[PDB]
Design a protein around this ligand. Structure first.
Ligand SMILES: [Mg+2]
Ligand SMILES: [Mg+2]
Ligand SMILES: [Mg+2]
Ligand SMILES: [Mg+2]
Ligand SMILES: [Mg+2]
Ligand SMILES: [Mg+2]
Lengths: 127, 98, 96, 79, 114, 151, 206
RNA sequence: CGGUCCGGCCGGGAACUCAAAGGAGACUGCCAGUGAUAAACUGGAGGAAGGUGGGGAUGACGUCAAGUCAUCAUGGCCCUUACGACCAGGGCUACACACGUGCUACAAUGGCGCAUACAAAGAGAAGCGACCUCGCGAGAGCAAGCGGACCUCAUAAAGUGCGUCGUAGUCCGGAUUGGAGUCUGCAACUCGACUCCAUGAAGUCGGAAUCGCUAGUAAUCGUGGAUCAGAAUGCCACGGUG
């Protein structure tokens, strides 16, 4: 069968599929390198496979929409680590100390009437 | 085959006068592809709250417009004759055609 | 907002349709690539107030021509003054 | 610089510009038609353009053609 | 390396050197070098004279340098001579094209003192 | 800071090294929220430096950074109609951060070409302590040890 | 001024909507004028009819309008007449056909609008404002009313300086969303000014 | 999974993303420490979320005879063949200046050229307007779909890859002016916005003084909307990187 695990981060939604095969990655029907596996998050995608050996052990096919570079990136990171419950909840405990388990609840702060943007306050006159 | 888009400003009223229809289908007729939600259109308006000056003022309003889909598959003279005249619940736009 | 200046807009809104959209239609095809007989952009000497771009848009209830809104046909004041009393269906103070 | 497909002038003024040919010129013509593009058929006239308070006399010249009458009728009395 | 106008420019890419002319912006300067079999960025360090005069004549077509400045100052003077509004503006050292004068008219007005 | 004391958030390590310090550095240099380019500028300078010293890579930074590193600074007091500006002992955590900021901010004021070149040339300049940055040391150490009577 | 409208704030919950139909951008406005035009004619014809609150829904190319009055008999009239005459006009105003109900007002001293309007007819009638507020509040807590406050202001009794004089009694938490709060306004056109009346009535919990 | 014109496109599938209704969940509750054995605070565990989790809405009695008779309403006062009313043209866009708020820059953390990867939120029938065609261009001709998770407004820009420039008043910067055009509008002189060609100020980091922001913020990059025939560097809103 398959081992699913959604996972998301800031407007981004990334679904991960885990099957035991090889250290290749099928993100949006293209290579890890064919997307952003070298940019401002070269390997935040590989991370979930740090203390949980890989190299060529298990293979994974991933889709993702919304957000931008590092957002989709982190999203996937999370989704992987969640689909990675497959082996057991025995590893999803030191994966915690890695922080990969936590949904980064940080969102774009809204703009607010009276301000130039979110927090930024229209400079006011001397006195 | 028979598709009805529902809309109104009260959610816990639209899905109610919707379940009226779904049940009134899977009682008489049959099939029906459930109550599909769809996306809500929220048109917001923001206006100044002071009659003179003060722009930091302002009040922010919105009008949420919720939808439902319906979609009944077996047009049975009995169910198609059930929808009609047993419609009620005003303040709900219903559309059957295209 | 000053009766007179109000009736003016009614006369304008009337003219807008007595003539324009009607006999004014003859300028769309009349005065564009259909080639010239000049009496074309000439007959454009009708009332004056006879034109949509000459209407203003006034708070349907007061007349205040500022702070207006297309959805409701009113200006921010009376719009809120009504919104806070039901009056405007579906409309309530939002947040997010 | 604007009009594209056909220059513009007011009718009343145009009439004042034709009538003032086969009946010879005369004193200043008075229009408020600061909106009109000058025609060659105006040259050697005396058309007086309203500028807010009054109508200034303007002598249609060899090549004041593609311009408007309002151009020669300053309105703000600066200084 | 004067060419068409007495200006003697070089030591950079051709497309860019050509811009010294008082009458060629990127566009003209494109239609120029691209109308000779010359390249975008070939310096003058390789461009033999006989490869330069095929240019000199390509630029001989459109008014530039002296003749241009003349033409323009002329048009302006024409404005003034009429007595319109753009004219009264050129003559009155103020912004022609409508810009506010209540403030910020410094380019057409000159640094302030009073 | 008036009531609710804290600590300080911490950051992922250097994506291309694994160090906290360096990442801190890139942030220090980053701007307009440009990480992609910032790090590209940092590594290139640490690279040209790297070879130009031959002296390893990791500690090419460490050494030159050990020169800017301060020991004492000054906190203004303004007590009674007088500024009475007292010297204080800088903590071993800020120290490094300041040195980093004087380096970055120094190369920033250099008249070279690439910010990478400017950087490297400041870095190596400090390796032989004679830069702007090191002078900032030979400045804050001047200010204290003078007001040092305010211990 | 720093108070949020106690009615409009509750709308989402615990409070209805005196206009409850649905329309699209296209004629939402043309409908709004109609709406706040028939209340215009209606609160004029039935002012002595102790009208508390008119309501409107537009059931598909048609309009309903339920009039909440405290003296329904007088609005209904002899065998339907008083509502009959209304049918017509209202229908020739909205542009469509029009039913028209008449919800009774169970105990009117609990209706903010009718309390206020009373306190107004009083001032116009030339009674001591203090007395009016007092009575209102009293014989309002008389029959339930977890809380209440009336506040009438401006040229009270007829001074050159303007006052506000309020009178709270019982419990009134404007800050609680889930609380039932009826609030209203009524202008008094006094023979020398215009005194503003506002009233809050607190009816309870969830 | 099955058909394949590599398109979720045809069955179909109802898992998943998502959509929107109803729910659960976090409470100092537990472990420990400090603390008067209390309140709390600190740290830890689990946990998507720890100590109001993030952001909103919500603004007490009152203060300044603060602001609004021009939104509306209204006591009083005043003109009423005029302070009312219709029309045309102009002015609200003036310019020796001074102040506030902002936009755009002085540049290689970039300018330019080509290729190219990832959003969010919204608007739309007197409307949004594909495609194709014509123009270097703004646009124009002909014309489908869509009253809208279907169609269109849109083709994100920072970014990333290569090539160029090598610190120059420059290949930055774009003011100002000349010439010629487009569109909306009865009409663009006063006074529209945009495009094509040329034109290239001041500016190389800003005295005294002074403002904003404590986390997905500041900084920075683009997107949409309201008013609107047609004038956004403003306003309201949206997400990128951080
Ligand atoms: Mg009036
Ligand atoms: Mg208009
Ligand atoms: Mg509260
Ligand atoms: Mg006051
Ligand atoms: Mg440039
Ligand atoms: Mg704070």
């Amino acid at each position: 069968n398959q081992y699913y695990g959604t996972g998301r981060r800031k407007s981004s939604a990334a679904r991960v599929f885990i099957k035991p095969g090889n250290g290749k990655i099928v993100i949006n029907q293209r290579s890890l390198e064919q997307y952003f596996g070298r940019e401002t998050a070269r390997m935040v995608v590989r991370q979930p496979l740090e203390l949980v050996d890989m190299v060529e052990k298990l293979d994974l096919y991933i889709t993702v929409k919304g957000g931008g570079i590092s957002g989709q990136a982190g999203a996937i990171r999370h989704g992987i680590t969640r689909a990675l419950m497959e082996y057991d909840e025995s590893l999803r405990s030191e994966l915690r100390k890695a922080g990969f388990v936590t949904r980064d609840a940080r969102q774009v702060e809204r703009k607010k009437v009276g301000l130039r943007k979110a927090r930024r306050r229209p400079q006011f006159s001397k006195r | 085959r028979i598709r009805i888009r529902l809309k109104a400003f009260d959610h816990r009223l639209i899905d109610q006068a919707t379940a009226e229809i779904v049940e009134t289908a899977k009682r008489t007729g049959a099939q029906v592809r459930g109550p599909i939600p769809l996306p809500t259109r929220k048109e917001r308006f923001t206006v100044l709250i002071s009659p003179h000056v003060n722009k930091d003022a302002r009040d922010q309003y919105e009008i949420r417009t919720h939808l439902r889909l319906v979609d009944i598959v077996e047009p049975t003279e009995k169910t198609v004759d059930a929808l009609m005249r047993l419609d009620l619940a005003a303040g709900v736009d219903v559309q059957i055609s295209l | 907002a000053k009766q007179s200046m109000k009736a003016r807009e009614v006369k304008r809104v009337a003219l807008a349709d007595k003539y324009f959209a009607k006999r004014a239609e003859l300028k769309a095809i009349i005065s564009d690539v259909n080639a010239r007989w000049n009496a074309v952009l000439k007959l454009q000497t009708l009332p004056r107030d006879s034109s949509p771009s000459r209407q203003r848009n006034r708070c349907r209830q007061t007349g205040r021509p500022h702070g207006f809104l297309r959805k409701f046909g009113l200006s921010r004041i009376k719009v809120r003054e009504a919104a806070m009393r039901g009056e405007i269906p579906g409309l309530k103070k939002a947040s997010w | 610089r604007s009009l594209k497909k056909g220059p513009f002038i007011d009718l009343h003024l145009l009439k004042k510009v034709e009538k003032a040919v086969e009946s010879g010129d005369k004193k200043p013509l008075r229009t408020w038609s600061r909106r009109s593009t000058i025609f060659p058929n105006m040259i050697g006239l005396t058309i007086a353009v309203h500028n807010g308070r009054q109508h200034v006399p303007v002598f249609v010249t060899d090549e004041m053609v593609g311009h408007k009458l309002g151009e020669f009728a300053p309105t703000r009395t600066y200084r | 390396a004067r060419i068409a106008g007495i200006n003697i420019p070089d030591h950079k890419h051709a497309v860019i050197a050509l811009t010294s002319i008082y009458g060629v912006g990127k566009t003209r300067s494109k239609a120029i070098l691209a109308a000779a079999g010359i390249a975008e960025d070939v310096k003058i360090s390789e461009l033999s004279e006989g490869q330069i005069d095929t240019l000199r004549d390509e630029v001989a077509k459109f008014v530039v340098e002296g003749d241009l400045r003349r033409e323009i100052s002329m048009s302006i003077k024409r404005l003034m001579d009429l007595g319109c509004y753009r004219g009264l503006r050129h003559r009155r050292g103020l912004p022609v094209r409508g810009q506010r004068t209540k403030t910020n008219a410094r380019t057409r007005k000159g640094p302030r003192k009073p | 800071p008036r009531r609710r004391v804290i600590g300080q958030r911490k950051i992922l390590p250097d994506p291309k090294f694994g160090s906290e310090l360096l990442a801190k550095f890139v942030n220090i240099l980053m701007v307009d929220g440009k990480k992609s380019t910032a790090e590209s500028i940092v590594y290139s300078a640490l690279e040209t430096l790297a070879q130009r010293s031959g002296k390893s890579e990791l500690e090419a930074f460490e050494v030159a950074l050990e020169n800017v590193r301060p020991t004492v600074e000054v906190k203004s007091r303004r007590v009674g109609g007088s500024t009475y500006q007292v010297p204080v002992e800088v903590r071993p955590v800020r120290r490094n951060a300041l040195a980093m900021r004087w380096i970055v901010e120094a190369a920033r004021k250099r008249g070279d070409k690439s910010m990478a070149l400017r950087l490297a040339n400041e870095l190596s300049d400090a390796a032989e302590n004679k830069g702007t940055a090191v002078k900032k040391r030979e400045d804050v150490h001047r200010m204290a040890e003078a007001n040092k009577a305010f211990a | 001024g720093q108070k949020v409208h106690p009615n409009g704030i509750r709308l989402g919950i615990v409070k209805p909507w005196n206009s409850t139909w649905f329309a699209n951008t296209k004629e939402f406005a043309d409908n709004l004028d109609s709406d706040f035009k028939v209340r215009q004619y209606l609160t004029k014809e039935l002012a002595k009819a102790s009208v508390s609150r008119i309501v409107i829904e537009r059931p598909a190319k048609s309009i309903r309008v339920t009039i909440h009055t405290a003296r329904p008999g007088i609005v209904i009239g002899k065998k339907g007449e008083d509502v009959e005459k209304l049918r017509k006009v209202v229908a020739d105003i909205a542009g469509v056909p029009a039913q028209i109900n008449i919800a009774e007002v169970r105990k009117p001293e609990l209706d903010a609008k009718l309390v206020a309007d009373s306190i107004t007819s009083q001032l116009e009638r030339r009674v001591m404002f203090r007395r009016a507020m007092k009575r209102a509040v009293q014989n309002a807590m008389r029959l339930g009313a977890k809380g209440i406050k009336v506040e009438v202001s401006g040229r009270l009794g007829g001074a050159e300086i303007a006052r506000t004089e309020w009178y709270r009694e019982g419990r009134v938490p404007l800050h609680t969303l889930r609380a039932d709060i009826d609030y209203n306004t009524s202008e008094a056109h006094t023979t020398y000014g215009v005194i503003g009346v506002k009233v809050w009535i607190f009816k309870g919990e969830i």
